[PDB]
Tab-separated table of N, CA, C and O in Angstrom:
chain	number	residue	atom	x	y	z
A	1	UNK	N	28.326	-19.235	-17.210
A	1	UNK	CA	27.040	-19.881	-17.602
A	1	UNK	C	26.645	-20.939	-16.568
A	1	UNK	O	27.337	-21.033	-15.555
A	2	UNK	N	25.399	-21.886	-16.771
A	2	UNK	CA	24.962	-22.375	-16.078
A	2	UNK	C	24.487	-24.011	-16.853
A	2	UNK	O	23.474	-24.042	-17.551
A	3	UNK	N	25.305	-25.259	-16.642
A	3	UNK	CA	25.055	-26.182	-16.962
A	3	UNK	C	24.599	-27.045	-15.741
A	3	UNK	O	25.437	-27.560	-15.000
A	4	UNK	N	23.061	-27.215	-15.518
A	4	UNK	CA	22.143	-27.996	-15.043
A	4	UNK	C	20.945	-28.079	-15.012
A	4	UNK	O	20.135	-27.522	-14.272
A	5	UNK	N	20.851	-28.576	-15.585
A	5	UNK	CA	19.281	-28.959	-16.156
A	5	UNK	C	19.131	-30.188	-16.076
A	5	UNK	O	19.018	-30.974	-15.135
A	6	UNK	N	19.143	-30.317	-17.658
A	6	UNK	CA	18.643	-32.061	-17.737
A	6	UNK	C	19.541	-33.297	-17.162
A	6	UNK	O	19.075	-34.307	-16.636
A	7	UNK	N	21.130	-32.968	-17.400
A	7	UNK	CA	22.024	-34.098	-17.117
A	7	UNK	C	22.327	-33.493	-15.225
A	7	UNK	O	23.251	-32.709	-15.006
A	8	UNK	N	21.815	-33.778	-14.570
A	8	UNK	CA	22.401	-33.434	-13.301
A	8	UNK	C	22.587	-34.311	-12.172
A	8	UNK	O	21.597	-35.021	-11.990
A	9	UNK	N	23.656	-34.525	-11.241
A	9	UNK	CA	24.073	-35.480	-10.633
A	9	UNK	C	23.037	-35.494	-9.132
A	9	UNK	O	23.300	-34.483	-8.479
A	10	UNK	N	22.329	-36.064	-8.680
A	10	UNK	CA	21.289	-36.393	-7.608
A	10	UNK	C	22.037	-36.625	-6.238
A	10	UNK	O	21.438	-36.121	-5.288
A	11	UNK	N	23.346	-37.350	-5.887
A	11	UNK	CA	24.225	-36.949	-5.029
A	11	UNK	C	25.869	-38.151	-5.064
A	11	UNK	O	26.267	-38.986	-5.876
A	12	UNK	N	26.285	-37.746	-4.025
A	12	UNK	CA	27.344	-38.724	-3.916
A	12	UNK	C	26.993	-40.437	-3.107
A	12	UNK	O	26.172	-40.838	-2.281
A	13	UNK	N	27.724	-40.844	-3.617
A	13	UNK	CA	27.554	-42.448	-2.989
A	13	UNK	C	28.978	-42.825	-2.056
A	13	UNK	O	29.118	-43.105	-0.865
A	14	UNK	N	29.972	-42.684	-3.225
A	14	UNK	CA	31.481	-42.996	-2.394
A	14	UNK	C	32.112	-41.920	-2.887
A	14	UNK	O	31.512	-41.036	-3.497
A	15	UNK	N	33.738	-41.906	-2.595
A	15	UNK	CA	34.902	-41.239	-3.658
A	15	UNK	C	35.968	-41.734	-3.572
A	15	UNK	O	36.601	-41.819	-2.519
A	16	UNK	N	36.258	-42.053	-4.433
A	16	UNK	CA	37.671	-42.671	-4.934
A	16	UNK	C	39.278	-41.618	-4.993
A	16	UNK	O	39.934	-41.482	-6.026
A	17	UNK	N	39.522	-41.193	-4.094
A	17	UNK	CA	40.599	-40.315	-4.334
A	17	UNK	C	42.416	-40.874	-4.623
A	17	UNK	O	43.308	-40.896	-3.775
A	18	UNK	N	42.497	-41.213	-5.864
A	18	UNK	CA	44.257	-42.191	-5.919
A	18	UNK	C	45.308	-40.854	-6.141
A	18	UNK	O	45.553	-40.046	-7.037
A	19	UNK	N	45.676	-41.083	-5.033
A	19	UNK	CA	47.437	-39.982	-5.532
A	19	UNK	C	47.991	-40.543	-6.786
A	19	UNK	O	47.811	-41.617	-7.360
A	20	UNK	N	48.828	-39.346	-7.080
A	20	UNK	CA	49.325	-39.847	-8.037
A	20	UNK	C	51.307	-39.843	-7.568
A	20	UNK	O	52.223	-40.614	-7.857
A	21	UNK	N	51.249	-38.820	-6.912
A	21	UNK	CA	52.959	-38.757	-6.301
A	21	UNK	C	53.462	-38.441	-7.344
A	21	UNK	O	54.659	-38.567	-7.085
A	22	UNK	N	53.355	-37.937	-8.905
A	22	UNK	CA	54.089	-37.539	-9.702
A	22	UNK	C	53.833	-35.714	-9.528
A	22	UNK	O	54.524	-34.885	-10.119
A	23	UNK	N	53.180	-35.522	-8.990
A	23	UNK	CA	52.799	-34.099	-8.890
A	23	UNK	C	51.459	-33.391	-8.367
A	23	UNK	O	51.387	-32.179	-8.163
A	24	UNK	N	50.364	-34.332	-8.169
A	24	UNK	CA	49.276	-34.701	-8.677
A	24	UNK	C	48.448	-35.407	-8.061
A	24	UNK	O	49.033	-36.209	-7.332
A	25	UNK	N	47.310	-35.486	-8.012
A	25	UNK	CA	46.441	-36.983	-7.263
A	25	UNK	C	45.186	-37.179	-8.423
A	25	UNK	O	44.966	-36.461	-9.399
A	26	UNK	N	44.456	-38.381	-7.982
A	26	UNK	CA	43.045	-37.970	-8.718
A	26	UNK	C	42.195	-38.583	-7.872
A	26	UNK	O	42.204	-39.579	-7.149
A	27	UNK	N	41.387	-37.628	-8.192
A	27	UNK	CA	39.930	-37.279	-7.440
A	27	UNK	C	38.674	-37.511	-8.100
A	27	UNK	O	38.278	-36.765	-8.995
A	28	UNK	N	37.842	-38.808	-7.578
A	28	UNK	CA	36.736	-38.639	-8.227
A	28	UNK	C	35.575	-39.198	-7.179
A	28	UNK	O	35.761	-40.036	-6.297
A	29	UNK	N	34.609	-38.674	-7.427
A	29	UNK	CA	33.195	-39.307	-6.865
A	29	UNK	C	31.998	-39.698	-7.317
A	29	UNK	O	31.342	-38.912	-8.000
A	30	UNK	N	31.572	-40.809	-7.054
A	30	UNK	CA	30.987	-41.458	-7.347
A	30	UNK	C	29.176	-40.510	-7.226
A	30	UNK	O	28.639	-40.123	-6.188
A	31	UNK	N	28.669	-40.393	-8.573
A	31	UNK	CA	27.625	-39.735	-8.223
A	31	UNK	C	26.221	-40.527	-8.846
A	31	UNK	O	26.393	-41.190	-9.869
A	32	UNK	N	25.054	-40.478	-8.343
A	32	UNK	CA	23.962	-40.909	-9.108
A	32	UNK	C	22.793	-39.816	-9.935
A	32	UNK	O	21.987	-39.131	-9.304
A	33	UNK	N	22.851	-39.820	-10.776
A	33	UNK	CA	22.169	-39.069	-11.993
A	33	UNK	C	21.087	-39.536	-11.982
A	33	UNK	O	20.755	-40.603	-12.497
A	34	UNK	N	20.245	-38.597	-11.243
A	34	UNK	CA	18.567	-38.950	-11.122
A	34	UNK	C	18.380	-40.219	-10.613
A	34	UNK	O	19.328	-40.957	-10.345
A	35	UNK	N	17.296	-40.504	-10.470
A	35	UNK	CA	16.997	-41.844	-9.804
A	35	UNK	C	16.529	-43.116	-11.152
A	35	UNK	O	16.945	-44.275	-11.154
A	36	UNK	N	15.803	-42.652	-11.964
A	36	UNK	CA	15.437	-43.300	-13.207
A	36	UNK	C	14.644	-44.571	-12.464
A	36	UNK	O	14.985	-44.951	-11.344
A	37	UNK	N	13.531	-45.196	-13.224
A	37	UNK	CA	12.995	-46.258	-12.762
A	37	UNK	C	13.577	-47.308	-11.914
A	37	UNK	O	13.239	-47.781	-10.829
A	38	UNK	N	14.726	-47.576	-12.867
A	38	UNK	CA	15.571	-48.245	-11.898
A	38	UNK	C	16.859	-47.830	-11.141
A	38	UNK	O	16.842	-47.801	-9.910
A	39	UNK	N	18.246	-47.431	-12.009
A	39	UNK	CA	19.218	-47.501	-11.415
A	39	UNK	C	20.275	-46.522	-12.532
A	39	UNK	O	20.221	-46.559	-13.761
A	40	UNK	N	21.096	-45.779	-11.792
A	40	UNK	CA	22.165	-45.175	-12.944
A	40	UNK	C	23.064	-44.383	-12.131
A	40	UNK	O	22.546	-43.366	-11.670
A	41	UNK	N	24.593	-44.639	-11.760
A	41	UNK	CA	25.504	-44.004	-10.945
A	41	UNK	C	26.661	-44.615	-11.647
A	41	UNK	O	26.716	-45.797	-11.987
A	42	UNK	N	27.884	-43.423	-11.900
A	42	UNK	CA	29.337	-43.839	-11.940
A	42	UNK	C	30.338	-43.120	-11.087
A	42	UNK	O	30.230	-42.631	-9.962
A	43	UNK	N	31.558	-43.201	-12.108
A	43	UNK	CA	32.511	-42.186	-11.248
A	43	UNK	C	33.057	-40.880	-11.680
A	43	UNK	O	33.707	-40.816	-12.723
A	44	UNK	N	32.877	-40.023	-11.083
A	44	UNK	CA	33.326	-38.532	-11.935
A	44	UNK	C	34.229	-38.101	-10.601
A	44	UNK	O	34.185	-38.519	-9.444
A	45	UNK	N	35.031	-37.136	-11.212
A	45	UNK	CA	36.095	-36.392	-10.663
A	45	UNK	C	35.554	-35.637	-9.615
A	45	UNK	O	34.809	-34.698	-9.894
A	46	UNK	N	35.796	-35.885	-8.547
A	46	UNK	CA	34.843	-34.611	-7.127
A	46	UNK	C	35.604	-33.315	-7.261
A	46	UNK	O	35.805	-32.569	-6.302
A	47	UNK	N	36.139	-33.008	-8.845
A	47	UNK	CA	36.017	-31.767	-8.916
A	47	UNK	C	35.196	-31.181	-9.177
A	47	UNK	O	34.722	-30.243	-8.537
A	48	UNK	N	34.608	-31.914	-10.880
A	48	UNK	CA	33.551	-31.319	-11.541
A	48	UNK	C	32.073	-31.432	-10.612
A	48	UNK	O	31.095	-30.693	-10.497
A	49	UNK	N	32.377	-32.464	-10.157
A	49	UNK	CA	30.926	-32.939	-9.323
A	49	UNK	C	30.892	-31.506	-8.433
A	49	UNK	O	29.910	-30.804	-8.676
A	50	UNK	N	31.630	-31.102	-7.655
A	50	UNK	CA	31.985	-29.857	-6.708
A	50	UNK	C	31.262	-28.955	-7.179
A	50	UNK	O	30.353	-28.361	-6.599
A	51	UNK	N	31.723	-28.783	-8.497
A	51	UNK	CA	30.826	-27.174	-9.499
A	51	UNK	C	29.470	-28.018	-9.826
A	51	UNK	O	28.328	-27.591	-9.658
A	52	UNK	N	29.766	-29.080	-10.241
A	52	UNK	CA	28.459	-29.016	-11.142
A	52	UNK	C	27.155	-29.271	-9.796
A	52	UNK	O	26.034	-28.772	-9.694
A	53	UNK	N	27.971	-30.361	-8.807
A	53	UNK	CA	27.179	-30.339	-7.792
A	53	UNK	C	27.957	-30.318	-6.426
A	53	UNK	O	28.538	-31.283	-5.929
A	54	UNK	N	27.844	-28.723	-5.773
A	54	UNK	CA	29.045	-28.438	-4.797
A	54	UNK	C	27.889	-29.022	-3.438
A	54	UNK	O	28.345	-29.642	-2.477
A	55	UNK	N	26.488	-28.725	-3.558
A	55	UNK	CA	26.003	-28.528	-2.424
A	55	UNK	C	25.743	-30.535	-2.368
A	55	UNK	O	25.192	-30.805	-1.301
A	56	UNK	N	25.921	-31.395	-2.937
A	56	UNK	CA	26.120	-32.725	-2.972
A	56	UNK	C	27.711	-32.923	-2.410
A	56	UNK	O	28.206	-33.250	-1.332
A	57	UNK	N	28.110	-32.630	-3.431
A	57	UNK	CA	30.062	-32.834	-2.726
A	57	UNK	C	30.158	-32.414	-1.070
A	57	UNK	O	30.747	-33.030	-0.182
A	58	UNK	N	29.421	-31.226	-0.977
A	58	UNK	CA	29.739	-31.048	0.012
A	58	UNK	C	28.967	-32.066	1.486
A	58	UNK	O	29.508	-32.462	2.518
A	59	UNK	N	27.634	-32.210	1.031
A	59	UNK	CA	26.953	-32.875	2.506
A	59	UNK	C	27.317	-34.483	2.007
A	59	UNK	O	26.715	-35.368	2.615
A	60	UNK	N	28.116	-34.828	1.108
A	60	UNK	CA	29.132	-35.901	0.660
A	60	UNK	C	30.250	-35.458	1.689
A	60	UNK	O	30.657	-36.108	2.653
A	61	UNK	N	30.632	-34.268	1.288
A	61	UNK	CA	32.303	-34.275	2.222
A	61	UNK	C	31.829	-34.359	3.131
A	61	UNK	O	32.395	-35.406	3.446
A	62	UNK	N	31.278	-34.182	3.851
A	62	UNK	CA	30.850	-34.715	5.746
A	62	UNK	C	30.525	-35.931	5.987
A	62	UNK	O	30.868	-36.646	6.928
A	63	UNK	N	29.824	-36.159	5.073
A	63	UNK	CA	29.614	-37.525	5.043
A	63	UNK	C	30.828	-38.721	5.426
A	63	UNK	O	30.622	-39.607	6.255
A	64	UNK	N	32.144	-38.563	4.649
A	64	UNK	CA	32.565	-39.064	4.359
A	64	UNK	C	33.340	-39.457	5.971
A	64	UNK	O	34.092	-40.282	6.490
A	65	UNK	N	32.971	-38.883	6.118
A	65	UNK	CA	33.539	-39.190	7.910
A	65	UNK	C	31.973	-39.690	9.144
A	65	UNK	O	31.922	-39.392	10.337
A	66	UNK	N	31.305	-40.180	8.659
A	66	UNK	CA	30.256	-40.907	9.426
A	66	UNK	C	30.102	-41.972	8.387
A	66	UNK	O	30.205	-41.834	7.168
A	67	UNK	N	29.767	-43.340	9.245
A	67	UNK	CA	29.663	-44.320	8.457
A	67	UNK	C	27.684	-44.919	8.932
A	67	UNK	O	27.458	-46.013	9.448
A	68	UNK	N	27.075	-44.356	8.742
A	68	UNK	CA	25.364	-44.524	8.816
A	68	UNK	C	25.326	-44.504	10.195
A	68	UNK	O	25.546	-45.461	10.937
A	69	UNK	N	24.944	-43.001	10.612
A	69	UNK	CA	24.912	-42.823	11.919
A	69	UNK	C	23.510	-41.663	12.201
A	69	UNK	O	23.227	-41.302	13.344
């Protein structure tokens, strides 16, 4: 199926990735959900963000190696 419509993430800002060394890491990125009059972004897992928004994660993952260039 296909969940995006109304709740959908607009792009990445940062990502927070903490190992975990028990087996494991966690992965999340920071995304903003529409622009709204004013303001609205948290942190979600750059997994789900990936599916729910791969083509964000992704010009995020490049991103993440230029710092405003």
């Amino acid at each position: 199926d296909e969940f995006e419509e109304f709740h959908v993430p607009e792009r990445i800002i940062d990502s927070q990735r903490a190992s975990l060394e028990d087996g494991t890491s966690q992965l999340q990125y920071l995304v903003k959900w529409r622009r709204l009059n004013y303001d609205e972004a948290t942190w979600e897992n750059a997994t789900d963000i990936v599916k729910l928004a791969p083509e964000q994660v992704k010009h995020f993952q490049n991103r993440e190696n230029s710092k405003i260039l």
